[PDB]
Amino acid sequence: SDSFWEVGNYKRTVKRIDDGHRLCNDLMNCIHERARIEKVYAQQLTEWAKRWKQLVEKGPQYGTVERAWCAFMSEAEKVSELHLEVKGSLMNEDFEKIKNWQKEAFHKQMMGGFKETKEAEDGFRKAQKPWAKKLKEVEAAKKAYHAACKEEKLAISRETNSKADPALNPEQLKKLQDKVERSKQDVLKTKAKYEKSLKELDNATPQYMENMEQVFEQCQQFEEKRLRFFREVLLEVQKHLDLSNVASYKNIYRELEQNIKTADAVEDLRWFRANQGPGMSMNWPQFED
Amino acid sequence: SDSFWEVGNYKRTVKRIDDGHRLCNDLMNCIHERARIEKVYAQQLTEWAKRWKQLVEKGPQYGTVERAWCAFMSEAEKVSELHLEVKGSLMNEDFEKIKNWQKEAFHKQMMGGFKETKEAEDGFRKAQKPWAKKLKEVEAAKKAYHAACKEEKLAISRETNSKADPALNPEQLKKLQDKVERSKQDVLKTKAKYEKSLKELDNATPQYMENMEQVFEQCQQFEEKRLRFFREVLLEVQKHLDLSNVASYKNIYRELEQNIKTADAVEDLRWFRANQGPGMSMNWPQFEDD
Hints:
homodimer, 289 residues, mainly alpha, Substrate Binding Domain Of Dnak, Chain:A, Domain 2, rod-shaped, cytoskeleton (chain A), lipid-binding (chain A), membrane (chain A), cell junction (chain A)
């Protein structure tokens, strides 16, 4: 069957160790690709802000409304910086934390594979070998007993089949009656040895189960570290992504609203009247020589 | 000078009308391009979420930690959705609002240009024409007076320059002393005309300023609507960009923290033990015959 207790079925547990290292890679890559997306967003906002600050300044819009318009681009620059901090945190802290953890947990061998994996497999084998030897003996004794059971059944099926032949002197009967007695004993002998090997196996099961449990718990604890670590890192990632908790993010739009509200149509119009319209001084024609 | 009150210098005001339309385009394109950046961010998050929800599920990670990991992708899907709402608001509300306002404020004429600009142009010209017409007459009367001052000074000069000529004659004296008198009375006439032209110009100045202010005031009004509109739109734009307000954004990371915390190492370990470890049932060897 597929039971863990069957010889060699500890392999799923050993394989989980290798999968642990592979999953650290996936998580690192997962965070890295997310960080890259944050950078692209930041970069495009920066270009957009730089582009339009230039287009507004070169253009015919001036006064307080120009300043209000420019506040819009300043918002993009601040949001951009914020998202670059997200990238920074994901890479310099979270990503690097997994990288260091993986480096300390998994040690690659010259011939390939991790020492941690080999240690578990060697552990299971050491615990399972004594029980596997006794199990080998039971199988052999089972064959010997089953064989003698048939050899003894084939003798009776010859003794009773001879009681039809009339030419049956007592020598031929004693021959067949002794073949049955000899086979009867060959069965009892093997039944005992086959029963003995089972008792020796049952007496080895407790130690076998204890030793396998011991190595299995080491594998569980090692896995426990990775799982709890994954839970830990993910909570730190959600911190770095969450901008709804940082005060500076709210300040961006509090300040943006303030600067936009400084837009004063009255003031802009006052200026145009005084410096471009009827408000300008004028030398009205006078008498001259 | 470059004074507004000088002929033709109303042009800067008329030009401001055209700039108004151009600035609507700039503002629309400015918002439009910002909206595109939002969409790109939303799209990349979506693909990243789709990509890794698949990689994690096909991978060897299972149990509650898998679910916690998957909550990370779900966060990106929700932020993406949130930023697509920003894009939608910027385009369907803000961008569209400017487009409709522009359509209503500026009307292109068949021969090019805007009806609004031609109105201001014609208004200024109509109000300036009668004042400029009087100004031309003044300049003409000014020259005629200055020229009379020259022709006179020449007469006085040539009169005294004959007082040093031995061949003088009471006839040529009377003749050239009369030219001095003609140029003299020719001066005061042109002086009186040049003064009268200025007096007429001074009487036409009040209406000139009144009519000029009237057209300019209308230009100020038209401009005020644009400025106040820009202030209104931008304030609606900053609302649509501000995710720090909406509770939905804060819920994304409340739920994310919540789902991650569901990760339970002990539960995952107990599972592996039961279905893959010592917990599994076992048909231990018994006695068997036949």
